Amino acid sequence: EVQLVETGGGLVQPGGSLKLSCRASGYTFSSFAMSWVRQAPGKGLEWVSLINDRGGLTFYVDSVKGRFTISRDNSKNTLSLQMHSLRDGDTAVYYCATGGMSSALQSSKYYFDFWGQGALVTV
Amino acid sequence: DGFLGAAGSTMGAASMTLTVQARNLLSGIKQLQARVLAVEHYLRDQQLLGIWGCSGKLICCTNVPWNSSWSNRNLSEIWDNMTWLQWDKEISNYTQIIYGLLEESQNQQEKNEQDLLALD
Amino acid sequence: DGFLGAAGSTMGAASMTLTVQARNLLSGIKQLQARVLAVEHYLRDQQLLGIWGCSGKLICCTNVPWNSSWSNRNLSEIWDNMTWLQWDKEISNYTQIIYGLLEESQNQQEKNEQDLLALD
Amino acid sequence: DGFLGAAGSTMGAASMTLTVQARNLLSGIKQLQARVLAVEHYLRDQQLLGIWGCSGKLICCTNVPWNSSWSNRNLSEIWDNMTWLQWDKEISNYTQIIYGLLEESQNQQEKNEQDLLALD
Amino acid sequence: NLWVTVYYGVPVWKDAETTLFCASDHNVWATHACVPTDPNPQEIHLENVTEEFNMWKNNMVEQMHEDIISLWDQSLKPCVKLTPLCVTLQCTNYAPKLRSMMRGEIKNCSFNMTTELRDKKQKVYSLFYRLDVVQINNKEYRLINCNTSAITQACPKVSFEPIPIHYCAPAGFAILKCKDKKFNGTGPCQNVSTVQCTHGIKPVVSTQLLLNGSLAEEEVIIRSENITNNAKNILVQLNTSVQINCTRPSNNTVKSIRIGPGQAFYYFGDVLGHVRMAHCNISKATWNETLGKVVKQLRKHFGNNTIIRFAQSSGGDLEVTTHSFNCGGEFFYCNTSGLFNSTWISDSLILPCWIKQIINMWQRIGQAMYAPPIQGVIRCVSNITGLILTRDSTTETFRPGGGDMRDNWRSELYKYKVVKIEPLGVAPTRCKRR
Amino acid sequence: NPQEIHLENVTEEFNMWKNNMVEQMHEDIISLWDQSLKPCVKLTPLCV
Amino acid sequence: IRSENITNNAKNILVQLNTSVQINCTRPSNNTVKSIRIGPGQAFYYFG
Ligand SMILES: *[C@@H]1O[C@H](CO)[C@@H](O[C@@H]2O[C@H](CO)[C@@H](O[C@@H]3O[C@H](CO)[C@@H](O)[C@H](O[C@H]4O[C@H](CO)[C@@H](O)[C@H](O)[C@@H]4O)[C@@H]3O)[C@H](O)[C@H]2NC(C)=O)[C@H](O)[C@H]1NC(C)=O
Ligand SMILES: *[C@@H]1O[C@H](CO)[C@@H](O)[C@H](O)[C@H]1NC(C)=O
Ligand SMILES: *[C@@H]1O[C@H](CO)[C@@H](O)[C@H](O)[C@H]1NC(C)=O
Ligand SMILES: *[C@@H]1O[C@H](CO)[C@@H](O)[C@H](O)[C@H]1NC(C)=O
Ligand SMILES: *[C@@H]1O[C@H](CO)[C@@H](O)[C@H](O)[C@H]1NC(C)=O
Ligand SMILES: *[C@@H]1O[C@H](CO)[C@@H](O)[C@H](O)[C@H]1NC(C)=O
Ligand SMILES: *[C@@H]1O[C@H](CO)[C@@H](O)[C@H](O)[C@H]1NC(C)=O
Ligand SMILES: *[C@@H]1O[C@H](CO)[C@@H](O)[C@H](O)[C@H]1NC(C)=O
Ligand SMILES: *[C@@H]1O[C@H](CO)[C@@H](O)[C@H](O)[C@H]1NC(C)=O
Ligand SMILES: *[C@@H]1O[C@H](CO)[C@@H](O)[C@H](O)[C@H]1NC(C)=O
Ligand SMILES: *[C@@H]1O[C@H](CO)[C@@H](O)[C@H](O)[C@H]1NC(C)=O
Ligand SMILES: *[C@@H]1O[C@H](CO)[C@@H](O)[C@H](O)[C@H]1NC(C)=O
Ligand SMILES: *[C@@H]1O[C@H](CO)[C@@H](O)[C@H](O)[C@H]1NC(C)=O
Ligand SMILES: *[C@@H]1O[C@H](CO)[C@@H](O)[C@H](O)[C@H]1NC(C)=O
Ligand SMILES: *[C@@H]1O[C@H](CO)[C@@H](O)[C@H](O)[C@H]1NC(C)=O
Ligand SMILES: *[C@@H]1O[C@H](CO)[C@@H](O)[C@H](O)[C@H]1NC(C)=O
Ligand SMILES: *[C@@H]1O[C@H](CO)[C@@H](O)[C@H](O)[C@H]1NC(C)=O
Ligand SMILES: *[C@@H]1O[C@H](CO)[C@@H](O)[C@H](O)[C@H]1NC(C)=O
Ligand SMILES: *[C@@H]1O[C@H](CO)[C@@H](O)[C@H](O)[C@H]1NC(C)=O
Ligand SMILES: *[C@@H]1O[C@H](CO)[C@@H](O)[C@H](O)[C@H]1NC(C)=O
Ligand SMILES: *[C@@H]1O[C@H](CO)[C@@H](O)[C@H](O)[C@H]1NC(C)=O
Ligand SMILES: *[C@@H]1O[C@H](CO)[C@@H](O)[C@H](O)[C@H]1NC(C)=O
Ligand SMILES: *[C@@H]1O[C@H](CO)[C@@H](O)[C@H](O)[C@H]1NC(C)=O
Description:
This is part of a larger assembly, with 1 copy of chain A, 3 copies of chain B and 3 copies of chain E. Chain B is an all-alpha fold. Chain B has helices at about 10-15, 20, 30-50, 75-80, 85-90, 95-115. The longest helix of chain B is centred in the N-terminal third of the chain and has 22 residues, at about 30-50. Chain E has helices at about 60-75, 145-150, 285-300, 320, 405-415, and strands spanning about 5-10, 15, 20-25, 45, 50-55, 90-95, 105-110, 125-130, 135, 140-145, 150-155, 165-170, 175, 185-190, 195, 210, 220-225, 235-260, 265-270, 280-285, 305-310, 325, 330-335, 340-345, 350-355, 360, 370, 375-390, 395-400, 415-420, 425-430. The radius of gyration of chain E is 26 Å and the shape is globular.
């Protein structure tokens, strides 16, 4: 019953920007941390960004520390990612996932529990 | 200078002697009652600072932004052209709001630190 | 919520309002004696926190491991399926041991920091 | 050991039990007056430590250098061949100077930190 | 895996006893040593909290008792001390031709008494009630107080009208209010709510029938420490009030004389009209219905095949054998035997009352009080809000009992408990101090 | 050697008619007077 | 033997013994006590 639905963009050129968004259903949104995982068309998986359940602590992979902003709205059950510059090497499918962190009073996670289907971002 | 010597000094100069006033807060049933009340008020001020994340500090910076409506004066007019007695009057109607904002921002900071420390 | 409004809330929810209870601890010889005793007990609790390395904090993490025998419940049962009133009863027989362990670990931490700072 | 058990111990050994003495400071009008006075003196000592930048600490290092004239003994003679009762007598004539220096160095540290945090 | 985390501000508490302070918005129970009340006091409902209450072990009752004793003694202390009244009185009947009650109840007593100067005595004629005067053997009599205690004359300027007093917790403590409809008096409460202070409680002094108290919300509630043990009192809280109309119809006058350099004595004067018996009326149908409700609820603890009988008091003096109250500043003692004479098997009632001026309150011996007479006709209207009953085969006989004033305050304080906040505790979390 | 610290550029408003120090001084004098007279001979025998 | 000053004859000497000496004190007479009332709540006790 858990579902994450990507509503992303399309093709942009280097120097522009693109905002991705995911809608969540089937679980309490505010109870889980969420993250973005990137997969280039011909490559494997890599982690890009992590946001905690309250949207107060954010972490990024070094390659995007100065380019991407991750935010969430717990009343809308919406996760979003604002990506700047978008170079040729950033073409990939961007997946939302639930898991990756737990807010001290919850049991340990350190894994991605649920996955969406992925938005395709091209350059 | 001595106790309250800076009362007529500007805020940016008066802040240099905060210790002088701080040390003068602790230094016959009616007199015993007055002493107990003074102790309770001292502790209430220390508790209020403690719940803001400002413990052993006389000058403490916070993460609450200034909302301008409280006072829209230039920073140099407040610190160089005002005394603390005047400033205490200009914003006397906003101190409860600021105190509430400080308490909330400290609660958020403590919860975020507790969660941040859990990342093995 | 208001004072003790969270008494029936779960521990993981009740901890959100610690400030509300903290602010209500300070807010005719018999009455003066009661006030002096209340002040002494407040200070004893603050001293006890101070000797553990938890000064201006409402939530404070320590380096004492949980020994399981004190309580072997799952973390999610304690924080989501228990109130603080019940928890205070389950471990009422172990608080002296935990307090002693916290005092010892703080003594070790302070001595190690004092020695660490000496490395020119 | 127990309360004041370390009184005859050397300084480098006696410092191991600071908590033991710290916990014994808080633990009929004349008796009520004595209790209020004891509370005021406890708070005066805590305030004095607070204005030096030493809040929740029993051992606190500072940036005031030792001027030698206060005591020109070798470090190992002070810590291994002296008790705290003797040391309290050797430098009983210099504690006001040291306290003033500590207060000034804390004022300088707090102002420098306030300015350092402003570098956007 | 898990580490100890310290939390301060934890919403937990322990049972505790402490000193509560007075709060209230001349008068014996309204002194200046009381904190003005909060015009908008707070109440915080506690969801999912089931605290255990015990009205019979509630330390608030002893403090309230001591505070009332202290206020009473403080108010009576700075007043005239009537040691000169321990003299021989020469008394005759006030109204030798009376053919009604009060015949022989009021005596016209002559005595000397001192004056402003120590070298001269006066001659004073005054009236006393029979209950205040005992024969020595126109007959010689003395006041009852000269047997055990000198009397302090109450200051005529200090009212005895009950004024509600609120009790407030000191910092660090909280008061929990049961709010459980049909509360047993002991046991868990499902509607526990935290309050800053209690409701106002009137320090009403009475025996046998509780006056101007709180009513039950759903039904008559019968509470006792132990029902089986016949030595315990039973407090019956009614869900309706019964209106009581008490009066002293005589148009009494007050005279006064000087007795010393700055002291004056007030005494009963003449009667500007007929001498009449003090009395009090209770509606008959209302009382019968109320008593029927009490028996209906009382049967639940004894059985539905029993006989519940009511009878008047047995031994003791008028402090415990009769109903007593302060009406208009006068002290009335009423027979009540017409209220408790019935057997219960599965338009206006008039009670005579006597007036007594020599008072020994709080069941103390050695500290007598003299109530000055009040000029004029006295009438008051009171509410019966509860009864005190004692136990005395399938037939059970109940009597008014009473006399211990703490029983008159538990009926109001039964819903409050004092707890101490201990806002410090530990819990395991996945959080290490680096 | 009591201290006095002059306050430069301070203009406080005073009101001698609403000064609570007067009532305390009055009560303190009454208290001292009564305390001193209390432990003394009470001459009630002179009302002759 | 302890004193503030032995030379000064105005000071007292306190001698603390290392053994106790047993003292047997008595009032052998079989004394009675009588009492009378003297006022409204007062009574005086006297040798009978
Ligand atoms: C239970 O509560 C009822 C009230 O609900 C209470 O009855 C009331 O008692 C008071 C005090 O006895 C009555 O107040 C008096 O009313 C008469 C009216 O003629 C006044 O003359 C009285 O005057 C006194 O107070 C004045 C204050 O200014 C003085 O100037 C004057 O000299 C007197 O000292 C006084 O105001 C009140 O009228 C009754 N209420 C009714 C409806 O009768 C009852 O007593 C309570 N129960 C018990 C056991 O106390
Ligand atoms: C008072 O005013 C003078 C003149 O403007 C100024 O120099 C001084 O710093 C002010 N403050 C004090 C404390 O004198
Ligand atoms: C500033 O205060 C006003 C009310 O005085 C409020 O409406 C506004 O939202 C505040 N601004 C911010 C940024 O909080
Ligand atoms: C009380 O119980 C209800 C029902 O389980 C729950 O929703 C609520 O959070 C609990 N706590 C409080 C304070 O109501
Ligand atoms: C846990 O507590 C028991 C006693 O209750 C003790 O024997 C044991 O050593 C403790 N474990 C640790 C790791 O300290
Ligand atoms: C006292 O002196 C002895 C002998 O030098 C030494 O061993 C001991 O540590 C000293 N201190 C105490 C507290 O006994
Ligand atoms: C040491 O103290 C003396 C006075 O006792 C003073 O003259 C000297 O300057 C001090 N030294 C330092 C480095 O402050
Ligand atoms: C009052 O004193 C006089 C003294 O001569 C005495 O004769 C008289 O009988 C006394 N009155 C009473 C009522 O005893
Ligand atoms: C006087 O007091 C005694 C007890 O002290 C009592 O027995 C006696 O009955 C009293 N006198 C009268 C007339 O009641
Ligand atoms: C307790 O409170 C609830 C909610 O107000 C109410 O429905 C229930 O009847 C109360 N319990 C009693 C015994 O009155
Ligand atoms: C009082 O309780 C009785 C039951 O004993 C009930 O019949 C009556 O209606 C109640 N009165 C009110 C006003 O609720
Ligand atoms: C209250 O209920 C309990 C049932 O646990 C009962 O034993 C007790 O006697 C009751 N109290 C009264 C006063 O009836
Ligand atoms: C109540 O009184 C009876 C009297 O016989 C006694 O047996 C019973 O134990 C008492 N109740 C309690 C709880 O002690
Ligand atoms: C009582 O008598 C006085 C005499 O002056 C009169 O004024 C008053 O009205 C009378 N009161 C009654 C109730 O008769
Ligand atoms: C008491 O009797 C005397 C007898 O002469 C009389 O004068 C006096 O008026 C009577 N007392 C009263 C109150 O009438
Ligand atoms: C008591 O007096 C009121 C009016 O004040 C009246 O309505 C009521 O019926 C009276 N009751 C009795 C029993 O006299
Ligand atoms: C009135 O009293 C009689 C007993 O004298 C009783 O049988 C009857 O039920 C009572 N009426 C009511 C309404 O209780
Ligand atoms: C009450 O009156 C009855 C007569 O109806 C009498 O037998 C009883 O002794 C009286 N009780 C008191 C306490 O005076
Ligand atoms: C007595 O009861 C009536 C309701 O019948 C109520 O209106 C009145 O206020 C009550 N009196 C007191 C003093 O509580
Ligand atoms: C105690 O000993 C000292 C020796 O220093 C001596 O002077 C003093 O008098 C002695 N005290 C007594 C009471 O003998
Ligand atoms: C003891 O008393 C003698 C008396 O002559 C005096 O000379 C001596 O100084 C006293 N001792 C001290 C220590 O003062
Ligand atoms: C003293 O005399 C009384 C007289 O009753 C007697 O009981 C008592 O034993 C006597 N005691 C001695 C010691 O003779
Ligand atoms: C004192 O002397 C009188 C003389 O009659 C005698 O009766 C009395 O008993 C004596 N006192 C005692 C205590 O015997």
